[PDB]
Design goal:
The structure is cut from a larger assembly and holds 9 protein chains of 9 kinds. Chain C has a single domain, classed as Aminohydrolase, N-terminal nucleophile (Ntn) domain (Glutamine Phosphoribosylpyrophosphate, subunit 1, domain 1, 4-Layer Sandwich). Helices cover about 35% and strands about 25% of the residues of chain C. In chain C, strands 8-1-2-9-10 form a 5-stranded antiparallel sheet. In chain C, strands 3-4-5-6-7 form a 5-stranded antiparallel sheet. Chain F contains 6 helices and 10 strands; from the N terminus they run αββββααββββααββα. In chain F, the strands form 2 sheets. Chain F has a 5-stranded antiparallel sheet with strand order 8-1-2-9-10, with helices on one face. In chain F, about 50% of the residues are buried. The chains are: A alpha+beta (about 110), B alpha+beta (about 250), C alpha+beta (about 240), D alpha+beta (about 230), E alpha+beta (about 240), F alpha+beta (about 240), G alpha+beta (about 240), H alpha+beta (about 240), I alpha+beta (about 200). The interface between H and I is small, with 12 and 9 residues. β3 of chain B pairs antiparallel with β7 of chain F. The complex binds chloride ion and magnesium ion. The site of magnesium ion has 4 residues of chain I, from loops. Chain A: It comes from Saccharomyces cerevisiae (strain ATCC 204508 / S288c).
Chain lengths: ~110, ~250, ~240, ~230, ~240, ~240, ~240, ~240, ~200
């Protein structure tokens, strides 16, 4: 039977300071016991000083990042180029994820 | 695109008339004469075969049609409208009756279904009424023989005998003088031929006249043997030769 | 007859132009924007003395930071307010923030042209949408059934609009206080109203950053009416 | 006369009057100008107010980082069409990772407007659009009419008294086309162009609206004190 | 009367006046032609230069369907684009199901049935274009012309627009003088001449010439635009003949 | 008077749109004729190609509906081709659903029913065409069945259609009065085609070249149209007698 | 488009009337008269057939009086074809109620729903209204014997005695004159026939131009019986009251 | 589906179909609502061109929407049934989700919204009905009286009338109703309501219906004799 | 949910229903009223799947109350029971069926007789002198077969009911936290507070 999910491995890490924040992630991409790429980035600048990573099943991860990046674009179009605050981005991402509650994005997301 | 005509094309005028129904009846008046006579042991329905051209084969155009083995129909008015009504009438006898009860509908109920179809063309969106009047003759076990008229409005009436179309006024008067409650089927056929000669102008023979009966069961027309309860259709269309035989002793 | 979405030879939509005439028959509504807040006022106009005037609801809350006044076929405004409230709350659910006043107005105006052969005709009511947000501060918008909205420093709509607007042209300046604006709405309403203005046939409201959208009591407005009469007699 | 009740009806001379009446709404609209060189494309628009208490109706809308338009006529119709362009530009990026060609943008707008001129119940769009952009084949300027007709030009103008600016640009063609690698000069030419369509009114700080896109410049709009430089 | 106010209504003559009114819109449009040749077809069109501000070569009017069919039309330009969009859909589904590219006669009927459908109901308007189109298939070259009524025929040569009569007369001479056949490269030159001769009926604004062609030998059975040296050569041939 | 614009009854019980669709039938100014032999059914029609720029091979009003059924149309070509495509689709579906070739008369009825619907339903106009279907039916033999915009249909011994139809009709009537039979008593289809052309010449009073005619022939298990040279061969045979 | 040919069947006049409803009532006023009279021990339904022909089959005929269920019947005035559409809907509705609650449908509930259907055709859908007026005659254990009438507007009202169709004005005056509350069924039968005999457009009232029916508790103990009169039975009741 | 826009604007800014629906209301029998200090009374005219009526079974003019709210109307009778049914369904739906019966204001707001929807929906005509909705909110003793009309507007009234000759009875109520002192008792409120109808009706026999609503779902309809006593008493005081 | 009983005597119907609501290893409530008044003289008790029970009960209640307002009339217990049966008969062939079993106790005012109907989630209706749903019946039916008489008084019915609760409290595995008892008679519905 067809299994729509896979595991692309890797790991990510976010730490916050007083006037800064970092979002780190390794560049290795795998399936089973093979390496697919030694350099495949999964931490992305999404605009408005928001960095994002969706680690787990890379296809779902790329899809989510792609949709959020697009969400930021339309937030500008619809609300007079207003900056998307990190708290508002977080709430928006909740709805993106929960929208597929019964066929989930197989990723842990950090922004 | 799409049918934007979702509104009624037949509406009440200030005087209370339904224009399109009236105008449909006018179309029936222009139509060729047809009639029906009920006897004690049968029913006869008849009409003239108005040929459009002598090159045309009038055998290929059937004005009298079998609906069920024991029910037949004839009309006056618009031929194409009649043709599609016969298609629909044949189908509804199966879908809304035979496929449910395993037997053919009684005359009155099949008539009722045809009347419903004609009523809906009077009220539904984006359609005109049917431009025909039907005469439906038939037999069933619990009602015996019966004859009905169906008008463009969807109204139907049971008749001992009647006529519709071109010369219906004169034909009805002729039938009133000749009809009694003791008529045998052969006597009714004789009167049908007499009544029709008055309205026909040109040739009057078995090739220009179309005539069918509802009478005794016809085992020879069944197509198979072995089932005692199945005895054959009561509807029979008279042949060209059978009509001419009766025109000599006229 | 003729199509509902038909253009006139002058390049205007018949039905939209006709709905603008209905709005001219409506009761007067005035709005004034200041740096201390936005004031919204309306003429109630009871058709009979037996009618309990406090049931006349022509000023309405959309959210805590957005209020609304109406003029014209006021029954048509119910579904517009219902949409506005849902849009405002829904945005807060999706983004954990207050929605911009302009974005709210644009969402309401999107409904306007959704008519034809969607609803069967345009709305027969104009709206004054007043509110505050962090980006653009205190704002006043005039929303029409054409789907168009203008921002205004001050605006009057309804039967007494063209006369009241000319008066607002002279009286408005960029340094008006909230109290000054309140009196100004009362003054201009009293001028264009048929019956004599009092606390029962007129209603005031405002929106401030601190306290949000508030409809005033009949007791509070009555004192502002008394304060207004005294000041006009004082010179 | 008897043939202007709806868009589905031709006149005896082969005219579509509802489309012509939609065209008339553009003529009543405030003037806007478009022009380009080989490196940049510029929109200049005169904004209109209701009265001195009101704001000035915004004429220019951004569609993508590399594309946008100016409007003249029914503003809500411009909102519908610009929203469609935003989606089409966006579909091209998400699916093909490809910036939508300004020419295809024109073809898409043409076909969307056309469908509204051949069916019962609908109506033509009541707005004209000037689309500028910078893609893989350089700078571009398009003119959209709600009849469906889209046209690529070096320069043009639409709205009330647009004929003045259109004549000026026709004279200045050889000059402004070769303003390469100089944004401020290409704008100056557009501001001088729109000035040929003014009557009794002049260009003020909250009246003028300018937009620009080019080789190393995203589509950006200038209003308020940012256009004081050009008066 | 009132028989002309609604599409799909028969007049007492048996005519659909709305379609005849759409033909008037076509007659108002610019001139376009089609020439059938030895092993292919050639298309050409008149582009009126309304202003100096029009970018030359950049408002292309001739359209390709699939990879082997060319289409040109006169009248309401948006209506023509709608028809080509449908033509592209029709050709795509044919190739999807049957593998082979759509034959020209088959393609002709797809457009014909679609245009004819827009004369059957009052809820749609007839097409305001006459479309000249054709190409090369397994049975050789074919040229067609389709009208607002849905009527179409095969042609040796075809013309429509404001200068159709001038162009038709010039086309008839070629048919008479070349019974054995005209070559592809010759037809391109002749197409230029005929557009220039047909421009006499639209001579206020000067114009821009646009040509395209399909040929079994010259273009390998695919639709291509005529550009550069071959275009200028065809322009010069036309310029020499008017003087 | 909107009762003349759509298919609703007039006060005198008439459908004017149907009547005006009949007048569209003659818009092409072409006459057609159909006769039956012993083994075959022949249909002929005039072919007028006025424009010199037209490709004459593409100008046709005869259609091959199925392998066994042919159809000639009297009326404008757009409506003609509309009818043809539908008939082809209906005949194909019939074969798939019921396992045998659609008879000529059954297709005629089906197309007539469709035409009837347009006379009753408002949103659909009638087609301005008269359809003549021909075949050699495996049960009924040589067959001619004809349809019109009213939804009427009937079988024919022979028939004619067009502006000068009445002249052709009486010409055929007078022949069948003389011969005393329902068909052309001839063995080969070649001579039945010759009969058809001969009697059209007499009725219309015009001479025909090879390019002035269009001929369709139905035999057992195939219907086919003739080329210009097939007709020329036929014209030569008539002239040499 | 098709706007051109729309009659707009569901609109108001400037005076606030519904054109199509008013014109449908005008149609009904030419239909054969039908009378309903409610007594303390039963209900009478009497109706006049529309100008009969001598060759009409009278015994196997139904034009005016229809059975909805065992406890409820209707008298029709208007288009018969329209009435049969509504009658079949009413018959189905009664069976739905019986299936749901295991009790015979109360008369008013059936009347309301049929009247609600008529109302719908006047407010939406753009179709012509049903050209029919009903007299409902029925019994249930809540209100006992009941007479109702409905018309194309979808408005219904209850009655002690009522007429529909032709000459209602004259018929209602005559009923209003001779009717009293303590009346019996046999007296009501006589009043019904006497009224038709005086209001008829025919020369003389005969058995072949009438349909007749009673709803009595004249069965055996606490149960209701519907009697649709046969031709010979109408002939006898016409002699018994001395009309012929 | 039937799509036609029947309710549309005219050049002068009027929606004629809505305005013609008001004419249907003007044709309807008169209805009046008066609220006292502790009650609301709904009075209704019944035309007397209909004798031989059966008043047991004939639809009553005042309808219970719930046990605590009532609705009377003027205009097309058939139309009113559709509004009453919808209102009754919404009443039960409100109890189901909110676990509390409707307020009179809420029920009125719903009915008014339905009427408004039929003024800008395709294929439908407006309701030819104006309503008077009266009752008491749950656990509240303050009387409530509201009015709705075809356009969809609604409002609260101390006393109001609708239907034919309503302008005459409104005139009467405007001078006979004191806002400072409403009818203190049930008797006083019924009498003022009957008086107002007697300005328009004809005979005080079987022409007037009266329904009294008191707090906590206390609704009762008066009989002929009970109403006739008010009619008899008023006429004797009049002869002065 | 779990225990619901019913007894029809001479002049009344008595319904007893358990007070416990248990989820997992925790009794979340011990005062739950597993009943809804459908009309003044009709009461319905219920037991089954969590959520489904109350949702179904309140849905039926709303429908009967709607009927009462529309017709200004109270449906007979027989009529109400048939309506309920049909709803459950529809439900059983739905995508997700209501898993609810009910008892309907009513007093028919037209007949002046008490009536008790037992209906399961499949839509299986029976009129009975005494009824039960779930495992309760396995004890109470035999007990009532012995001690029940058709001419008993309401007081005799309550004593007969005490005998059933005592037996269940002795032999049932689960603690059902006693019962709420309600009586349906000519004067309507009332609750016994001390049981
Ligand atoms: Cl068929
Ligand atoms: Mg059970």
């Amino acid at each position: 039977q067809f299994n729509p999910y896979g595991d692309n491995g890797g790991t990510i890490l976010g730490i916050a300071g007083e006037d800064f924040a970092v979002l780190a992630g390794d560049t290795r991409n795998i399936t089973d016991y093979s390496i697919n790429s030694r350099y495949e980035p999964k931490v992305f600048d999404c605009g408005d000083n928001i960095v994002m990573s969706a680690n787990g099943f890379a296809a779902d991860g790329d899809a989510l990042v792609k949709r959020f990046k697009n969400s930021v674009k339309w937030y500008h179009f619809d609300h007079n180029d207003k900056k998307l605050s990190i708290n508002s981005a977080a709430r928006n991402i909740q709805h993106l994820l929960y929208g597929k509650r019964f066929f989930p994005y197989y990723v842990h997301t950090i922004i | 695109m799409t049918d934007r005509y979702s509104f009624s094309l037949t509406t009440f005028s200030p005087s209370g008339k339904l224009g399109q129904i009236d105008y449909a009846l006018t179309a029936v008046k222009q139509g060729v004469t047809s009639l029906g006579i009920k006897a004690t042991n049968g029913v006869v329905i008849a009409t003239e075969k108005k040929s459009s051209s002598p090159l045309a084969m009038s055998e290929t155009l059937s004005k009298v049609s079998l609906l069920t083995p024991d029910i037949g129909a004839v009309y006056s008015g618009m031929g194409p409208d009649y043709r599609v009504l016969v298609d629909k009438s044949r189908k509804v006898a199966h879908t809304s009756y035979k496929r449910i009860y395993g037997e053919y509908p009684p005359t009155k109920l099949l008539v009722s279904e045809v009347a419903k179809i004609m009523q809906e063309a009077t009220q539904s969106g984006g359609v005109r009424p049917f431009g025909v009047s039907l005469l439906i003759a038939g037999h069933d076990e619990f009602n015996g023989f019966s004859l009905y008229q169906v008008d463009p409005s969807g109204s139907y009436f049971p008749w001992k005998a009647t006529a519709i179309g071109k010369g219906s006024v004169a034909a009805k008067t002729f039938l009133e003088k000749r009809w009694n409650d003791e008529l045998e089927l052969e006597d009714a056929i004789h009167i049908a031929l007499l009544t029709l000669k008055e309205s026909v102008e040109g040739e009057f023979n078995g090739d220009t006249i179309e005539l069918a009966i509802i009478g005794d069961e016809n085992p020879d027309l069944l197509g198979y043997t072995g089932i005692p309860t199945d005895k054959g259709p009561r509807f029979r269309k008279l042949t060209s030769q059978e009509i001419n035989d009766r025109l000599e002793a006229l | 007859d003729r199509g509902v979405s038909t253009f006139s030879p002058e390049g205007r939509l018949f039905q939209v132009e006709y709905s603008l005439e209905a709005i001219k028959l409506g009761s007067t509504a005035i709005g004034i924007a200041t740096k201390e807040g936005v004031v919204l006022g309306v003429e109630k106009r009871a058709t009979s003395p037996l009618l309990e005037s406090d049931s006349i609801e022509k000023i309405v809350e959309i959210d805590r930071h957005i209020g609304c006044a109406m003029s014209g076929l006021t029954a048509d405004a119910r579904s517009m307010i219902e949409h506005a409230r849902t849009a405002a709350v829904t945005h807060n659910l999706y983004y954990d923030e207050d929605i911009n006043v302009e974005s709210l107005t644009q969402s309401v105006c999107d409904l306007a042209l959704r008519f034809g052969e969607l609803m069967s005709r345009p709305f027969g009511v104009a709206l004054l949408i007043a509110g505050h947000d962090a980006d653009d501060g205190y704002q006043l918008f005039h929303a029409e059934p054409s789907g168009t909205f203008y921002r205004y420093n001050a605006k009057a709509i309804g039967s007494g609009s063209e006369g009241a607007q000319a008066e607002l042209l002279n009286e408005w300046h960029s340094s008006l206080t909230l109290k000054e604006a309140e009196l100004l709405v009362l003054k201009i309403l009293k001028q264009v109203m048929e019956e004599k203005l009092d606390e029962n046939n007129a209603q005031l409201s405002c929106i401030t950053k601190q306290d949000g959208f508030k409809i005033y009591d009949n007791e509070k407005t009555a004192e502002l009416i008394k304060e207004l009469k005294e000041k006009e007699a004082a010179e | 006369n008897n043939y202007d009740g709806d868009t589905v009806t031709f006149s005896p001379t082969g005219r579509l009057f509802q489309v012509e009446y939609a065209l008339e709404a553009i003529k009543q609209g405030s003037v806007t100008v478009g022009l380009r060189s080989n490196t940049h494309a510029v929109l200049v628009a005169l904004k209109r107010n209701a009265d001195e208490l009101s704001s000035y109706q915004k004429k220019i809308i951004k569609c993508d980082e590399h594309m946008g338009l100016s409007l003249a006529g029914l503003a809500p119709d411009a909102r519908v069409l610009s929203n469609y362009l935003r989606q089409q530009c966006n579909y091209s990026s998400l699916v093909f990772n490809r910036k939508l060609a300004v020419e295809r943008a024109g073809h898409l707008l043409c076909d969307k407007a056309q469908k509204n001129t051949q069916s019962y119940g609908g109506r033509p769009y009541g707005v004209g659009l000037l689309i500028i952009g910078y893609d893989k084949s350089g700078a571009h300027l398009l003119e959209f009419q709600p009849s469906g007709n889209v046209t690529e030009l070096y320069g043009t103008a639409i709205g009330a008294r647009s004929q003045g600016a259109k004549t000026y640009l026709e004279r200045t063609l050889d000059t402004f086309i070769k303003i390469d690698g100089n944004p401020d000069e290409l704008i100056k030419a557009g501001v001088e162009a729109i000035s040929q369509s003014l009557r009794d009114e002049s260009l003020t700080v909250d009246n003028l609206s300018i937009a620009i896109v080019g080789k190393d410049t995203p589509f950006t709009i200038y209003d308020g004190e940012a256009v004081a430089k050009y008066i | 009367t009132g028989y002309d106010l609604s599409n799909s209504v028969f007049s007492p003559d048996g005519r659909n006046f709305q379609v005849e009114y759409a033909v008037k819109a076509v007659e108002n449009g610019t001139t376009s032609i089609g020439i059938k040749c030895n092993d292919g077809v050639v298309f050409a069109v008149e582009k009126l230069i309304t202003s100096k501000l029009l970018v030359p070569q950049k408002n292309v009017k001739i359209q390709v369907v699939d990879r082997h069919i060319g289409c040109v039309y006169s009248g309401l330009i948006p209506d023509g684009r709608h028809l080509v969009n449908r033509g592209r859909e029709e050709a795509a589904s044919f190739k999807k199901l049957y593998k082979t590219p759509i034959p020209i006669p088959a393609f002709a009927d797809r457009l014909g049935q679609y245009v004819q459908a827009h004369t059957l109901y009052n809820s749609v308007r007839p097409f305001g274009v006459s479309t000249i189109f054709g190409g090369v298939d397994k049975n050789g070259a074919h040229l067609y012309m389709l009208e607002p009524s849905g009527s179409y025929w095969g042609y040796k040569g075809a013309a429509t627009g404001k200068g159709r009569q001038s162009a038709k007369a010039e086309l008839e001479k070629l048919v008479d003088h070349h019974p054995e056949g005209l070559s592809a490269r010759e037809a391109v030159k002749q197409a230029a001449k005929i557009i220039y001769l047909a421009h006499e009926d639209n001579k206020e604004k000067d114009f821009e010439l646009e040509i395209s062609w399909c040929s079994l030998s010259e273009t390998n059975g695919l639709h291509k635009f005529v550009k550069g040296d071959l275009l200028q050569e065809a322009i010069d041939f036309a310029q020499k003949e008017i003087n | 008077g909107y009762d003349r614009h759509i298919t609703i009854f007039s006060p005198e019980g008439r459908l004017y749109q149907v009547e005006y669709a009949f007048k569209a039938t003659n818009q092409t100014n072409i006459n057609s004729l159909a006769v039956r032999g012993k083994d075959c059914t022949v249909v002929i029609s005039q072919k007028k190609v006025p424009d010199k720029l037209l490709d004459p091979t593409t100008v046709s009003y005869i259609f091959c509906i199925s392998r066994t059924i042919g159809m000639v149309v009297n009326g404008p070509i757009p409506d003609a081709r509309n009818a043809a495509l539908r008939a082809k689709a209906e005949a194909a579906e019939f074969r798939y659903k019921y396992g045998y070739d659609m008879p000529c008369d059954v297709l005629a009825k089906r197309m007539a029913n469709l035409s009837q619907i347009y006379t009753q339903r408002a949103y659909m106009r009638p087609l301005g065409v008269i359809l003549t279907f021909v075949s050699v039916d495996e049960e009924l033999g040589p067959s001619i069945y004809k349809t019109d915009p009213a939804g009427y249909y009937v079988g024919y011994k022979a028939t004619a259609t067009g502006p000068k139809q009445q002249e052709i009709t009486t010409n055929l009537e007078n022949h069948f009065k003389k011969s005393k039979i329902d068909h052309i008593n001839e063995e080969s289809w070649e001579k039945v085609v010759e009969f058809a052309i001969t009697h059209m010449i007499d009725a219309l009073g015009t001479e025909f070249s090879k390019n002035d005619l269009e001929v369709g022939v139905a035999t057992k298990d195939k219907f086919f149209t003739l080329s210009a040279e097939n007709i020329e061969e036929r014209l030569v045979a008539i002239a040499e007698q | 488009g098709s706007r051109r040919y729309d009659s707009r069947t569901t609109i108001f006049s400037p005076e606030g009337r519904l054109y199509q409803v008013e014109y449908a009532l005008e149609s009904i006023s030419h239909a054969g008269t039908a009378i309903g009279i409610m007594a303390s021990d039963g209900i009478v339904l009497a109706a006049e057939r529309k100008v009969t022909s001598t060759l009409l089959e009278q015994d196997t005929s139904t034009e005016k009086l229809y059975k909805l269920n065992d406890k409820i019947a209707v008298a029709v005035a208007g288009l018969t074809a329209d009435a049969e559409i509504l009658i079949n809907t009413a018959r189905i509705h009664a069976q739905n109620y019986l299936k749901t609650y295991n009790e015979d449908i109360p008369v008013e509930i059936l009347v309301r729903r049929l009247s609600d259907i008529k109302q719908g055709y006047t407010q939406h859908g753009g179709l012509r209204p049903f050209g029919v007026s009903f007299i409902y005659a029925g019994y249930d254990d809540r209100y006992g014997y009941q007479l109702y009438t409905s018309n194309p507007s979808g408005n219904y009202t209850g009655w002690k005695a009522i007429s529909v169709g032709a000459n209602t004005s004259a018929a209602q005056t005559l009923l209003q004159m001779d009717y009293k509350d303590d009346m019996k069924v046999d007296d009501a039968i006589e009043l019904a026939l006497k009224t038709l005999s005086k209001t008829t457009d025919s020369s003389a009232l005969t058995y072949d131009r009438l349909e007749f029916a009673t709803i009595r508790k004249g069965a055996n103990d606490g149960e209701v019986y519907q009697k649709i009169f046969k031709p010979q039975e109408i002939k006898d009741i016409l002699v018994k009251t001395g009309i012929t | 589906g039937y799509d036609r826009a029947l309710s549309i604007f005219s050049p002068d800014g009027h929606i004629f179909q809505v305005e013609y629906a008001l004419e249907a209301v003007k044709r309807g029998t008169c209805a009046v609502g008066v609220k006292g200090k502790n009650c609301v009374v709904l009075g209704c005219e019944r035309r007397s061109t209909l004798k031989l009526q059966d008043t047991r079974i004939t639809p009553s003019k005042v309808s219970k929407i719930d046990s605590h709210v009532v609705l009377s109307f003027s205009g097309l009778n058939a139309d009113s049934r559709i509004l009453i049914e919808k209102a009754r369904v919404e009443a039960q739906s409100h109890r189901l989700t909110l676990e509390d019966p409707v307020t009179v204001e809420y029920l009125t707001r719903y009915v008014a919204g339905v009427q408004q929807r039929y003024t800008q929906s395709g294929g439908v005509r407006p309701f030819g009905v104006s309503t008077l909705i009266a009752g008491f909110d749950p656990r509240d003793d303050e009387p409530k009286l509201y009015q709705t009309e075809p356009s969809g507007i609604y409002s609260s009234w101390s006393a109001q009338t609708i239907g034919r000759n309503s302008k005459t009875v409104r005139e009467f109520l405007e001078k006979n109703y004191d806002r400072k002192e409403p009818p203190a008792t049930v008797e006083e409120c019924v009498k003022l309501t009957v008086r107002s109808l007697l300005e328009v009706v004809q005979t005080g026999a079987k022409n007037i219906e009266i329904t009294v609503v008191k707090p906590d779902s206390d609704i009762v309809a008066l009989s002929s004799e009970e109403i006739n006593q008010y009619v008899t008493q008023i006429e004797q005081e009049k002869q002065e | 949910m779990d225990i619901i009983l019913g007894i029809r005597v001479q002049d009344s119907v008595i319904l007893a229903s358990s007070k416990a609501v248990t989820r997992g290893i925790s009794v979340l409530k011990d005062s739950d009223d597993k009943t809804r008044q459908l009309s003044p003289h009709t009461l319905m008790s219920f037991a089954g799947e969590a959520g489904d029970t109350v949702q179904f009960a309140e849905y039926i209640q709303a429908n009967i109350q709607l009927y009462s307002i529309r017709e200004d009339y109270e449906l007979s217990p027989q009529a109400v029971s048939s309506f309920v049966r049909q709803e459950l008969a529809k439900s059983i062939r739905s995508r997700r069926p209501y898993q609810v079993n009910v008892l309907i106790g009513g007093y028919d005012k037209k007949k002046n007789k008490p009536e008790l109907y037992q209906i399961d989630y499949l839509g299986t209706k029976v009129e009975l002198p005494y009824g039960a749903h779930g495992y309760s019946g396995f004890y109470t039916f035999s007990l009532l077969d012995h001690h029940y008489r058709p001419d008993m008084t309401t007081e005799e019915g309550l004593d007969l009911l005490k005998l059933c609760v005592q037996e269940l409290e002795k032999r049932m595995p689960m603690d059902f936290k006693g019962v709420i008892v309600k009586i349906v008679d000519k004067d309507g519905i009332r609750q016994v507070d001390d049981f």
